[PDB]
Each structure stands twice: as structure tokens, then as C-alpha cells.
Amino acid sequence: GTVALREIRRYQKSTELLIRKLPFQRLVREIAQDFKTDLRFQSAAIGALQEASEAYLVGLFEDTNLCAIHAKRVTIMPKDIQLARRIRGER
Amino acid sequence: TGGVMKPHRYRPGTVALREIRRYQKSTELLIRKLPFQRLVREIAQDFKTDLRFQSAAIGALQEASEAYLVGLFEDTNLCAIHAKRVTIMPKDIQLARRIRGERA
Amino acid sequence: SRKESYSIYVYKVLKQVHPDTGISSKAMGIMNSFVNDIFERIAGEASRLAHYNKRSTITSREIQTAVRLLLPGELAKHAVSEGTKAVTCYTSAK
Amino acid sequence: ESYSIYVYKVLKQVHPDTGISSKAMGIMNSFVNDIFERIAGEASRLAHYNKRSTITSREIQTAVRLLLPGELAKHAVSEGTKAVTCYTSA
Amino acid sequence: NIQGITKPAIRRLARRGGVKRISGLIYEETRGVLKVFLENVIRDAVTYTEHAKRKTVTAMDVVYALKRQGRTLYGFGG
Amino acid sequence: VLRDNIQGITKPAIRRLARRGGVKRISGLIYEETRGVLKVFLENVIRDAVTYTEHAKRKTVTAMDVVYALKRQGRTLYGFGG
Amino acid sequence: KAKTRSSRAGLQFPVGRVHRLLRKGNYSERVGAGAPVYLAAVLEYLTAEILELAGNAARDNKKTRIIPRHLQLAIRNDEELNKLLGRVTIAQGGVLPNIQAVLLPK
Amino acid sequence: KTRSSRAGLQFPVGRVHRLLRKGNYSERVGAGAPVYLAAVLEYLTAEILELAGNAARDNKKTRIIPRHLQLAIRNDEELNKLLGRVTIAQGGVLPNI
Numbered sequence: 192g193t194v195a196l197r198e199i200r201r202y203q204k205s206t207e208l209l210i211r212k213l214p215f216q217r218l219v220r221e222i223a224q225d226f227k228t229d230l231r232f233q234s235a236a237i238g239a240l241q242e243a244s245e246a247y248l249v250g251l252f253e254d255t256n257l258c259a260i261h262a263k264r265v266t267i268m269p270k271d272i273q274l275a276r277r278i279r280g281e282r
Numbered sequence: 283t284g285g286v287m288k289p290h291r292y293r294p295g296t297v298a299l300r301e302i303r304r305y306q307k308s309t310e311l312l313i314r315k316l317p318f319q320r321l322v323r324e325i326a327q328d329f330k331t332d333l334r335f336q337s338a339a340i341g342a343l344q345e346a347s348e349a350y351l352v353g354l355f356e357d358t359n360l361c362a363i364h365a366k367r368v369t370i371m372p373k374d375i376q377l378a379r380r381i382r383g384e385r386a
Numbered sequence: 387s388r389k390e391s392y393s394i395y396v397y398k399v400l401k402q403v404h405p406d407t408g409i410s411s412k413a414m415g416i417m418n419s420f421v422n423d424i425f426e427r428i429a430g431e432a433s434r435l436a437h438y439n440k441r442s443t444i445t446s447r448e449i450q451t452a453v454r455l456l457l458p459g460e461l462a463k464h465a466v467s468e469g470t471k472a473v474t475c476y477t478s479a480k
Numbered sequence: 481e482s483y484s485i486y487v488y489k490v491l492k493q494v495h496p497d498t499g500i501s502s503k504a505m506g507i508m509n510s511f512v513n514d515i516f517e518r519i520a521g522e523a524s525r526l527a528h529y530n531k532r533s534t535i536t537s538r539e540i541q542t543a544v545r546l547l548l549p550g551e552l553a554k555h556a557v558s559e560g561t562k563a564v565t566c567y568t569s570a
Numbered sequence: 571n572i573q574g575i576t577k578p579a580i581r582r583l584a585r586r587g588g589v590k591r592i593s594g595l596i597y598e599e600t601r602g603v604l605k606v607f608l609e610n611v612i613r614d615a616v617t618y619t620e621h622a623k624r625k626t627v628t629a630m631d632v633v634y635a636l637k638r639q640g641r642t643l644y645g646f647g648g
Numbered sequence: 649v650l651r652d653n654i655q656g657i658t659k660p661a662i663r664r665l666a667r668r669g670g671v672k673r674i675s676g677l678i679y680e681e682t683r684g685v686l687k688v689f690l691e692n693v694i695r696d697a698v699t700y701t702e703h704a705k706r707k708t709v710t711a712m713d714v715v716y717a718l719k720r721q722g723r724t725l726y727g728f729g730g
Numbered sequence: 731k732a733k734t735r736s737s738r739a740g741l742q743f744p745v746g747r748v749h750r751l752l753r754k755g756n757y758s759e760r761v762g763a764g765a766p767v768y769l770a771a772v773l774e775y776l777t778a779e780i781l782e783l784a785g786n787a788a789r790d791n792k793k794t795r796i797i798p799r800h801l802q803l804a805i806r807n808d809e810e811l812n813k814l815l816g817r818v819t820i821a822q823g824g825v826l827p828n829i830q831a832v833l834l835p836k
Numbered sequence: 837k838t839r840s841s842r843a844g845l846q847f848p849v850g851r852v853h854r855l856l857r858k859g860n861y862s863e864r865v866g867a868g869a870p871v872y873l874a875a876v877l878e879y880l881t882a883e884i885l886e887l888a889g890n891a892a893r894d895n896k897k898t899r900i901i902p903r904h905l906q907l908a909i910r911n912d913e914e915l916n917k918l919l920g921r922v923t924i925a926q927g928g929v930l931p932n933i
Binding site: 500524547 | 845904914
């Protein structure tokens with residue numbers, strides 16, 4: 192439990208990206224391949240996608256933590272994920 | 283010996299589920315017109331007086347307020363169901379507003 | 387002065403798709419508001435997207451791309467096909 | 481085009497001894513462009529509503545009250561008004 | 571006249587959303603959030619009217635303000 | 649060709665992202681759901697970005713298109729132009 | 731005989747009106763010729779779909795009157811139409827009947 | 837000679853006027869609109885840079901970082917209310933446990 196708070200304190204003060212660059216790059220290319228072939232990508236576009244996806248996931252985890260806190264639990268569950276997404280309006 | 287046997291009462295929730303079906307089937311306004319009109323005038327008084335409010339503007343405001351409140355209660359019902367309760371509490375209202383972004 | 391509306395055309399297409407069904411005045415108002423709102427959305431998206439490529443013209447291409455950007459799913463594809471059908475029909479006549 | 485020089489001028493006005501990174505400069509440029517787009521678009525929308533073809537100080541002022549929240553907007557409106565009279569008195 | 575939004579009315583509004591049980595303390599909370607929402611929409615409609623050089627708020631200002639807040643309303647001349 | 653690459657988003661990466669959000673304990677079923685959510689979000693952004701590239705007769709996705717597209721999804725990004 | 735552009739393209743919606751509104755609605759100095767035809771066709775198809783589903787939903791209710799209730803039913807019961815018209819409130823449309831499963835007694 | 841010096845502003849009034857003219861918003865633009873818009877932009881940028889410099893000073897730094905901009909924006913009720921739907925690149929998150 193102690194190192195959980197240590198990880199929270201370390202990562203909430205840091206600003207570098209936490210998603211590894213090359214798997215995310217391959218993921219973006221794999222997703223984009225099935226819309227159009229032979230697609231090129233600027234590096235800045237991949238970086239913008241990485242930053243936006245990280246910000247979105249951080250916000251989703253914060254709202255999910257609020258939902259978990261509501262049910263008198265400390266562990267987040269998938270039902271919290273779809274609860275937050277449903278209330279936030281995603282389908 | 284002229285007494286009458288009583289039909290007793292319904293369980294808590296039966297008349298609730300009935301009136302749930304009845305109000306979800308019908309579409310009339312649920313807030314009384316005149317108190318809502320007075321409330322809108324009281325809120326509008328604080329900025330600049332002598333402001334006339336067309337009946338259609340008050341009706342549009344009432345429809346928007348009812349839609350907002352119904353949506354908020356649907357989200358709060360989802361919150362209550364998630365916490366293994368059937369009664370909504372103000373903490374669920376605050377949480378629904380928090381996740382919606384309405385409350386900072 | 388008068389105020390234009392889409393009431394007659396909505397009634398015409400309703401009579402085309404459902405000959406035995408009429409429509410109330412409130413539903414006419416909702417349909418008019420719906421058509422106007424969709425018009426503003428597509429026109430604004432086309433205007434923006436045209437401004438991105440430093441272009442001065444809204445053509446069929448800009449409207450088609452705006453339709454693909456807004457409409458969600460198969461609806462877009464169906465709309466695009468019919469729109470292309472209308473354009474070539476116009477192009478086939480004079 | 482960029483707003484780099486003007487942001488540098490106002491930065492050295494408010495903080496002569498403080499520097500700024502290039503990423504912060506890009507952030508400032510994006511922020512200024514976004515705020516400009518919001519205010520100008522809402523002013524145009526107001527001009528379209530009132531059947532007007534001219535954007536004057538009025539619609540800009542009301543767009544500023546519409547978008548910016550609280551005290552901020554008031555001081556901004558005051559600042560804009562002062563600029564207008566400063567323009568008018570020069 | 572915030573008390574004019576009476577307890578059966580707010581009970582009906584909660585009932586349309588499918589809610590079975592109502593806490594006793596929730597009514598003040600619903601009155602507060604309704605007041606906040608009405609305050610925001612009324613403020614925006616009032617400044618729209620003041621820009622329009624008018625003394626009477628019309629339905630168009632209300633629908634405009636609501637649509638600008640992402641709460642587009644159909645049926646009132648939009 | 650690329651096949652089954654979403655698993656490249658590692659489990660410690662999801663752990664770090666949750667730690668940034670203040671989450672104390674993590675269930676074992678969170679990772680697959682998180683991967684699905686990330687895939688949905690990426691697909692939604694990439695669809696609009698590739699449409700913007702196709703209209704301009706370009707063959708490369710630029711940063712501006714990705715910004716414009718997230719802004720069109722209500723996710724405005726500062727720092728990459730606009 | 732000066733034939734209307736709507737009759738030329740086989741549409742019911744006014745091509746001239748959308749052309750005038752595009753030209754007068756402060757978007758861009760000049761407007762291409764095919765854009766009003768395309769926009770009118772898109773608006774036609776969409777209004778046809780909405781009115782079709784609404785007439786069907788009225789038909790299950792044994793009614794010959796389309797009311798806002800049927801429009802709300804038609805919009806919310808179709809997945810893609812609900813996705814498109816997500817953030818709109820239909821006046822006098824009501825709410826779809828939905829009661830949760832665990833909300834019910836045992 | 838310049839309109840900026842006449843209005844006592846550092847932002848370019850001519851640039852705002854040019855963007856309004858070629859931005860396809862309306863047919864004509866009054867003379868007071870670009871001056872007013874430039875003044876609003878200058879006041880807002882001065883406010884946010886002031887709060888960012890204060891945050892940088894509190895963090896014992898001499899150069900403003902996007903971390904400092906994120907902290908300055910998120911610690912201000914009016915600014916974060918204005919910028920609720922904005923995610924700052926390389927900004928991180930606000931420390932909250």
C-alpha cells in the first residue's frame with residue numbers, strides 16, 4: 192500500500208509520457224491501415240495522438256476512481272469503466 | 283355486526299412502479315406553470331428590471347429545465363444502482379454532476 | 387413581411403413515403419427546426435474545411451466530405467450515394 | 481505567422497527576469513489563436529442574428545461578456561473600453 | 571419562490587427518470603441545481619436581449635442561449 | 649501487415665497511467681477493457697484525421713489535421729499548432 | 731418553359747432556397763453550382779428517413795397523427811439517428827419507457 | 837503613425853484587422869472591433885503569463901515550462917472554468933491525493 196502512494200506521488204509530479212513510443216506508433220499505423228493503404232505519418236501527428244490519448248486515459252481513470260470511491264471500495268473494476276463512459280456519454 | 287373489511291395497503295414500490303409507468307407513458311409538463319414563471323421572473327429581476335418574458339420563452343425554459351432534470355435523475359439512478367442501493371442520495375447527485383463536468 | 391419555411395416540402399415527402407398519414411403542427415415545427423439545424427451544421431463544417439485548404443469555393447466535394455464528417459455510419463454512405471446521384475442527374479440534364 | 485514578439489513584450493513587461501521555453505511559446509500561440517477564433521466567431525454569429533453586416537465594438541463587447549466568465553470579463557471589458565477611448569483620444 | 575417547486579412535482583420529475591425511492595434531503599439539492607441551471611440560461615438570454623436593443627425577452631433568445639450551451643431545443647422556431 | 653498489436657500497450661503502462669490518476673488498487677480485468685477503450689478512441693480520432701487528409705489530396709497525415717480532428721471531437725490540443 | 735432546378739434534379743426540396751441561404755449565410759465569397767443540389771439531396775434523404783420511422787412508430791400506435799412523441803420514439807429507437815441527434819431535446823417528446831432489471835421486485 | 841502606438845497596445849491591431857477581413861465572418865468590420873479584440877487578447881495573455889510567472893517563481897525556476905502553465909491554469913477558478921475542455925501538452929496533471 193505504501194508504494195502505491197509513492198507511485199502516485201512520483202507520477203503526478205512528472206510530465207513525460209508514460210506510454211511507450213514504438214508500440215503506440217505501430218498501433219496507430221495498424222488502425223490507420225484499414226481506412227486507407229500506403230499512409231504516411233508525420234512524427235508530430237503521432238506525438239499529438241499519444242499526448243491526447245494519455246490525457247484522455249488519465250481523465251477516465253480519475254473519474255473511475257471517483258466511482259470506485261462511491262461504492263465504498265478502493266479497487267477499480269470494469270463496471271466503473273462503463274459507468275463513467277455511460278454517464279460521460281460515450282457508447 | 284355491520285363492519286367493513288379493509289383492503290389494506292400496497293407494498294412500498296408497487297404504486298411507485300405504477301406511477302413510473304404512467305409518467306413514462308405520458309408527456310405533459312410536470313412543473314406547475316405559475317410557480318415556474320414566478321421563479322424565472324425572480325431570477326431575471328437580479329440583472330435588469332422591466333424585462334417582459336413572452337409565454338413562449340417561459341415554455342421553452344420550462345421544457346429545457348424538465349429535460350435537464352430528467353436526464354440528471356437518470357444518471358443519478360444509474361449511480362444509485364451502481365452502489366447497490368435503490369434510494370438516491372445527494373452524494374449521487376454531486377457525483378453525477380462531477381463526472382458530467384457541470385461541477386468543477 | 388413573410389417568413390419562409392420547409393413545411394410544404396416536408397409534407398410532400400411525407401405524402402411520398404406514407405400516403406395515408408398526416409402530421410400535426412408541432413411535429414411540423416420540430417421537422418423545420420431539425421432541417422434548419424442540420425443545414426447550419428453541414429454548412430459550417432463545409433465552410434471551415436474549405437477555409438483549411440485556403441479555398442474560396444464550396445463545391446460538391448466539400449459538402450460530401452462534411453457529410454462524411456458529421457453523419458454517423460451507414461447513413462453517411464447512403465446520403466453520399468444519393469447526393470452523387472442527384473449531381474449527375476443534374477449534370478445529365480441542363 | 482506567430483505572436484512570439486508580442487508575447488515576449490508582455491512577458492518582459494510583467495516579468496523582466498523570467499524566460500520562457502519554445503513549447504510554452506507554441507502553447508501561448510495556440511491559446512491566443514483559440515481565444516481569437518472563439519470571440520470572432522461569436523461576434524459574427526451575433527451579427528448574423530441581428531441582421532447586421534458590420535462588426536463594431538458592441539458585438540465584440542457582448543461576445544466578450546458571453547464567453548469569458550466572471551470578473552475577468554468585466555476587467556477585460558473595462559480594458560477594451562479604455563483602449564477604445566485611448567484610440568479615440570489619439 | 572424557489573419553494574414553489576413543490577415536493578410532489580420534483581417527485582414526479584424523479585419518477586419519470588425511473589427512480590423508485592427518494593431521500594428526504596434530496597429536494598433542496600434538486601432545487602439548488604435547478605436554480606443554478608436556470609440562472610445560467612436566464613443570464614445568457616438576458617444579455618442576448620440587451621444586445622438586441624429590446625425590452626422583451628423572446629423565445630429565440632432562449633433557444634439561442636440553450637443551443638450555445640450545447641442543449642439544442644427543437645420545436646420553438648430554431 | 650500488422651496483426652494483434654494492441655497487446656503492445658503493456659500492463660505496467662496502464663499501471664503508470666492509473667497511478668497518475670490517483671488509483672490505489674487495480675483489478676485484473678481492467679487491462680483488456682482499457683485496451684478496448686483506447687482502441688475505440690483512437691479509431692474515432694483517426695477516422696476524422698484520415699478524412700481531412702483525403703479531401704486535401706495529400707498522402708501524409710499532418711499534425712494540424714490531428715489537432716483539428718480532436719478539436720472537432722471537443723478535445724482541443726494546445727502546443728501543436730492551430 | 732423555365733424549369734425549376736428541383737425538377738431538373740428530381741428533388742422535392744428547393745435548390746434555389748438552399749443556394750440563396752448558402753450565398754447569404756456568410757461562409758465564403760463564392761459558392762459552387764453543385765453544392766446546393768448536393769445539400770438539398772442530403773437534407774431530403776435525412777428528412778425522408780426521420781419521417782418514415784416516425785410514421786411507422788405512429789402505425790404501431792394505431793394513430794394517423796404524427797405527434798412529437800412519435801418523433802422522439804423514432805429518434806431514440808434508432809442507434810445511428812440517436813448518435814447524430816445526441817445533444818438535442820425534443821419538445822413534448824417525452825422519454826422512452828425503460829425500467830432497470832434489478833429495480834424490479836422479486 | 838501605427839495604430840498600436842495610438843491605442844497604447846503591444847498587439848498588432850492591423851494583424852487582427854487583416855484576420856477579420858480575410859476570415860469570412862462578415863462583409864465589413866468597424867474600426868473599434870480590432871482595437872477592442874487586441875486589448876482583450878493582451879489583458880488575457882498578461883493575466884495568464886502573470887500567474888505562470890508566479891508559479892515558476894514558487895517552483896524556484898527561471899524559465900516557464902508547460903508544467904507551470906498547466907499549474908497556473910488549473911489553480912485558477914476563472915481560468916480553468918474558461919479552459920475546462922483543454923488538455924495542455926507536456927502539462928501533466930494537478931497533484932491531488
